[PDB]
Amino acid sequence: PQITLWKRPLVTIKIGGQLKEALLDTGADDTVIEEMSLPGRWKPKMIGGIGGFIKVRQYDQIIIEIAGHKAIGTVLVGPTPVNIIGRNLLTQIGATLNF
Amino acid sequence: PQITLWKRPLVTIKIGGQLKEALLDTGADDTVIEEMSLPGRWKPKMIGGIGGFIKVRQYDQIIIEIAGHKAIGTVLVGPTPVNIIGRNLLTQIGATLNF
Ligand SMILES: COc1ccc(S(=O)(=O)N(CC(C)C)C[C@@H](O)[C@H](Cc2ccccc2)NC(=O)O[C@H]2C[C@H]3OC(=O)N(c4ccccc4)[C@H]3C2)cc1
Ligand SMILES: [Cl-]
C-alpha cells in the first residue's frame, strides 16, 4: 500500500504467535517491541533516544509478519512506549519513502 | 525521490538560513530540532520518546526547507540527539510510505 502520513502509520504484526499493533518508524534503526516472551537466546542491550536510555533484550533471527509480509531479523524487547518497526525490518518488506 | 531504508533517511534542511542534517521520521508525530534561535513566540510541549518524556519549545509557522521542498509549520526545539522531520512536515512535502 501507499501510506499517507496524516495519521500514525500503524499496522498489525504477528510476532511470537501474537498479534500486536506497531508503528512503521523510518527514524528507528532497530525494531523495539513491548515486553513479551520470545524463544531462544538473547543478550542485554541499552538503547537511547529522546528521554534517555532503556534496557532491552536482543533476540536475533526472529520471524515476524508485518501487514501480511514475512521477514526475519533482530527484535529488541523492553519498556518502549510504543511497538516500533525499524529499518532493519522495513527494508525486508520493501518499504520506501516517496515524495 | 524514492528513498530506501538501508541507510538512515538523512536529508539536508534549511532553517534560519542555516543548513542542518535531519532524519525523515514516520514514527515522529512532530518535527524536533536541536537547540537553535527561532523567531516569534513559543509554547510549552511535552513529547515522549523511547526513554521517557522531555520538555520542548513549540514554535508555530516556521519557514523550513526539507530536501529542497518548502514548508511552513510547527517546529519543536529541545534536547533531541538528532534533528527529526516528523509527520507534520512530511505531509506538507507530500511524503508517503510505500510497500
Ligand atoms: C511528538 O513528536 C515526537 C515525539 C517523539 C519523537 S521520538 O521519540 O524521536 N520517536 C518516537 C517513537 C519512539 C515513538 C521517533 C523515533 O523515530 C526515534 C527517532 C530518534 C530519536 C532520538 C535519537 C535517534 C532517533 N527513534 C528512536 O527512538 O529509535 C530508538 C530505537 C533505536 O533506533 C535508533 O535509530 N536509535 C538511535 C538512538 C540514538 C542515536 C541513533 C539511533 C535507537 C532509539 C519525535 C517526535
Ligand atoms: Cl494518529
Ligand SMILES: [Cl-]
Ligand atoms: Cl536485523
Ligand SMILES: [Cl-]
Ligand atoms: Cl531495495
Ligand SMILES: [Cl-]
Ligand atoms: Cl505544522
Ligand code: NA
Ligand atoms: Na534467536
Ligand code: NA
Ligand atoms: Na511563530
